[PDB]
Design a protein around this ligand. Sequence first.
Ligand SMILES: [Ca+2]
Ligand SMILES: [Cl-]
Length: 134
Amino acid sequence: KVVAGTEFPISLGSKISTVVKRPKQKKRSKKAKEDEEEILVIEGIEFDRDVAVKFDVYVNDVDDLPSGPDKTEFAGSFVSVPHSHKHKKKMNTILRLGLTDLLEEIEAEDDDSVVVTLVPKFGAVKIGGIKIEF
Ligand SMILES: [Ca+2]
Ligand SMILES: [Cl-]
């Protein structure tokens, strides 16, 4: 299912994808800040600590056909091992993934946005938001 950016926060009960804008400086010049890593930030990841959580993150070129064959590229994963905490039932955390090499490999360096796919593997988890920044 394709989800708008304003649909977050969301419960990640199934695989979803969303269009994420690259940083604003890239709109003017696609090689702006070329010696800095371009970082995908998944914010507000929230779940019960006693629930094992895993989801995988993929990226694809925004111009690919969603009704066409999968051209998604693995970017990273979020994992939590079940545990208890002396004063918290839940964890609220973040995942940051480097995109610079990935965008070159998928040949999306000229694009202003990308598609991010989140693939739940186990555990109930909320995703607060997604952005790309330096
Ligand atoms: Ca493209
Ligand atoms: Cl926390």
